Sequence to fold (588 residues):
Amino acid sequence: KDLRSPICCILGHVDTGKTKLLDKIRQTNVQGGEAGGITQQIGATYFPIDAIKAKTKVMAEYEKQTFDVPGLLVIDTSLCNIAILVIDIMHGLEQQTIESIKLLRDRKAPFVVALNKIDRLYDWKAIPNNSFRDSFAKQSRAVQEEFQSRYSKIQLELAEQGLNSELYFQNKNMSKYVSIVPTSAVTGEGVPDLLWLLLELTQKRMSKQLMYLSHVEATILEVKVVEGFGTTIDVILSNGYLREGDRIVLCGMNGPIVTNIRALLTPQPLRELRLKSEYVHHKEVKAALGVKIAANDLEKAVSGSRLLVVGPEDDEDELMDDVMDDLTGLLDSVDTTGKGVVVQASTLGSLEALLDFLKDMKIPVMSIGLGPVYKRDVMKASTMLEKAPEYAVMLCFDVKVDKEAEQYAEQEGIKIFNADVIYHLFDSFTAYQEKLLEERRKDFLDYAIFPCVLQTLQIINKRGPMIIGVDVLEGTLRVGTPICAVKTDPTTKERQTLILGKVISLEINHQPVQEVKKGQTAAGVAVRLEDPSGQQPIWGRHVDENDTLYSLVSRRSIDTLKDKAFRDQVARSDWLLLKKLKVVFGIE
Fold:
């Protein structure tokens, strides 16, 4: 079959040696020879299949060699056919590695582990650019022992993340279990193994996805101003052809963009000057490669967008909506019932990450946007100055705030969070959010109410103190929880809350307990109530066995649960139950 080059994406923190590794992978030098024609493309490194043959020849000692693809495309960092996750063998799994994993697990992206820094093993004797198994067999038992120890431990850490993993040459299910390749960015050892392994995971196992199509599949990786071309887009082309003159369609920061390709540019191999970039122009390019596109009207292009070519039979305005679906999807996250915070980002990826980060922090999003922040955008935020000032906030990632807009912001006191790095923004905002919750909380007697719904099985003591036997229908019942009924006053047709009091104590089979959840018991729970402020409703007269009871929850009580010390212990079911109780209590 006719296949294009597999696209590989490499992830890791700088500290793992990730960038050193990539640079080692690129170099021309190998054992007795040179790897020829490795080219820097736009936002990617291209390895022609012959360069790959040269870099993996040493692998002929351990494996059958086949070459069914034209080459291999690597992106530094699902458009990726395969991801390479670099882990430091001397550190093991760290927090960021855990995050990259969940990310890959969520997106169903296949990946391999590069177990980097084996040169740091004590007494390691390097053979430059060798295969792993060859150098390894030449090492002392001490070196071998240290490797086994640190490797076996990382294997267990990966198992903790729900990943079954194995050294690649011992992997009995390469399509399921994660293959581990030991490497060294310093010596080049294991690089032949990694490249070999990437072919073995793509050529046949993913050939269907590598089948060269005529239909254009392209993705904008970066939006960049270039001397002489104005604003260009760096794209990865994964299927089809791009040609000068092609009418392209992409997502912009103010709706779809239609234009025509003016130039198709790749780096000039040998530049006369170090600060004057220039490019080879091409009439056409074939998947798969990284290529820069020049064209009018790209000034508002957004990184992360798909790029489509309007064909003969294709409708233009139809394809314009198609490319807006990715953002449209992200719009589904915004608050429909009123408003929350304003979010602005540089790319579709960074926006999705911010939304997701705000989602699990349970912070509502009023509005979303891409690119530079203007007066208009901060003016959207000013509509929260009256309602909830806690959300008179903008969360910006990697975007310029206009001078006018910045000046308006402190004129009206709107908080602007902005960062070039995702984590600093994430942390600095979580920092500010953690200040606000400490300030506000000291206003009511009980901080954080957990949600529950209760069915009264029997009244145990009518009053002084009211003690009720119940069945926990939903959620979790706790000591300190204020319990109530909700009943409609016939005279006014108004729904009223009838507070019975706060749980002093809980007993199951006459043995005390600190909390009871749905399913814990089937014997009933005796609930001892402390009187409330003002008159306790009278059993029979005001409240009886046919009334469903609820944790009394409030806007305030809900915000409190969004503190770090509660957020982790609130099951998903309890958040869902809280949403229902809002309707019971009339909380917007």
About this structure: The two ends are 58 Å apart (CA to CA).
